[PDB]
């Protein structure tokens, strides 16, 4: 509800690319995460099935191959890339209150520099942690107390792959848009 | 019942070692197999336990590690080493019936030569098939359809080892007794 009012405040005090394309893509990712993707991961552990009679083997194998869920990583990423925009708004509101270019410049050019770092950091984590963007149907697990190697089966691997590729692609576009914003301000000096 | 009458007929028409020690040890092995050992192997497959949820993995793993049961091998061995003695008895009875040294010599020296071969053959089979005379608590099985390698547990491994060593030792003694019988007839020529 009030989030729409928040967007209008953040909509102002930005450049053409920043006003429209960055904000639309940011809302785009939130909608995908909230209304569509969150129920795909609902039964991630409930429907995780292992071919064994060993008690506790299911708990350790799921924890080994999914140290942190994909949706939790995306939730953290959205929070981190949204804070520098929120910090600017409070700084401007604080600045206006005390009133009744250089300071504005350095705050703005720093905020879009942190967003690029955060986007690239989480994008790198997704790759190393899950060795690619495709989820497998079968995982082989040999952690204690599983005897030898145990076959375990993931829930909805194909649908999770579709949303993973979707979220990564949009994040890559947001990186390019922020990079161009730097170039526009770089040549203007 | 009538088996006791059979022994008395086989008791006669033999040499000192053959009359007593071979026949006593032969009865010795039958008693061990019948009254003691046969109920040790009763639950060999019923109590065979594998740590898996794969249907049919228990059937193939038991069949892989126990191609033929120990008690069935001993039953076959006793039958084979007993036939040459039975063949002599019918030959003598046939010979006596037609009546109303060389022939007796060659039949007798051949019969104790077949017993040595049969005893050594089955003794060799026990070794190669079961790689020693000690039964293990744990067997690792990777035959289809078992996924990867599956742990399976044998029933009464220690008691089966005790009877295995017992039967092998008595068979080894019977080999030596038959060998000496050859030496006694060899020097006499």
The total number of residues shown for chain B amounts to 189
Instruction: Put residue B148 in one of left, alpha, beta given phi > 0 → left and psi -120 to 50 → alpha.
Output: left
**Cβ A148 vs Cβ B150: under 8 Å:** yes
Give the Cα separation of B20 and B17 in Å (integer). 6
B43 CA: distance to closest CA in chain A (Å): 22
From A82, A151, A70, select the one nearest A112 (Cα to Cα). A82
Give the Cα separation of B189 and B187 in Å (integer). 5
- The experimental method is cryo-EM
Give the Cα separation of B167 and B38 in Å (integer). 13
Has A39 been labeled as part of a binding site?
yes
Both structure tokens of B58:
């228990």
A139 CA: distance to closest CA in chain B (Å): 12
In the structure, how many helices (H) and strands (E) does chain B have?
Answer: 7, 3
Sequence-distant (6+) residues with CB within 8 A of B84 are: B110, B111, B112, B114, B115
Mutation target to probe the B interface, by most B beta carbons within 10 A, among A49, A53, A141, A153 is: A53
Delimit the domains of chain A by residue range. Answer: 1-189
Both structure tokens of B22:
């071979």
Resolution (angstroms) stands at 1.9
Both structure tokens of B36:
């003691």
Has B39 been labeled as part of a binding site?
yes
Give the Cα separation of A14 and A82 in Å (integer). 14
CB contact under 8 Å between B148 and A147, yes or no, is: no
Has A42 been labeled as part of a binding site?
yes
Give the Cα separation of B106 and A174 in Å (integer). 101
**Cβ A109 vs Cβ A183: under 8 Å:** no
The helix (run of H) or strand (run of E) holding residue A20 is: none
Give the Cα separation of A160 and A7 in Å (integer). 29
Both structure tokens of B173:
């003694």
**Cβ A177 vs Cβ A116: under 8 Å:** no
Give the Cα separation of B138 and B136 in Å (integer). 5
> Which residue carries 């576009």 as its tokens?
A173
How many other CB atoms sit within 10 Å of the CB of residue B37? 21
> Which residue carries 């000690």 as its tokens?
B134
**Cβ B147 vs Cβ A151: under 8 Å:** yes
Both structure tokens of A10:
């953040």
CB contact under 8 Å between B147 and A147, yes or no, is: no
Q: Diameter of chain A by CA atoms?
A: 72
Instruction: Put residue A52 in one of left, alpha, beta given phi > 0 → left and psi -120 to 50 → alpha.
Output: beta
């Amino acid at each position: 509800g009030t989030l729409q009012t928040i967007l209008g405040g953040v909509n102002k005090h930005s450049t053409s690319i920043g006003k429209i394309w960055l904000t639309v893509l940011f809302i785009f990712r939130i909608m995908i995460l909230v209304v569509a993707a969150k129920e795909v991961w609902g039964d991630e552990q409930a429907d995780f099935v292992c071919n064994t009679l060993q008690p506790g083997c299911k708990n350790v194998c799921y924890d080994h191959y999914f140290p942190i869920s994909h949706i939790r990583l995306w939730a953290l990423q959205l929070i981190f890339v949204s804070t520098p925009a929120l910090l600017v708004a409070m700084h401007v509101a604080y600045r206006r209150h005390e009133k009744k270019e250089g300071s504005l410049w350095w705050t703005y050019t720093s905020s879009i520099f942190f967003r690029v770092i955060f986007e690239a950091a989480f994008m790198y984590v997704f790759y190393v942690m899950y060795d690619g963007f495709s989820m497998q149907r079968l995982v082989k697990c040999n952690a204690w107390p599983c005897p030898n190697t145990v076959d375990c089966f993931v829930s909805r691997p194909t649908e999770k792959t579709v949303f993973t590729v979707f979220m990564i692609a949009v994040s890559g576009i947001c990186i390019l848009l922020n990079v161009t914003e730097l170039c526009y301000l770089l040549i203007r000096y």
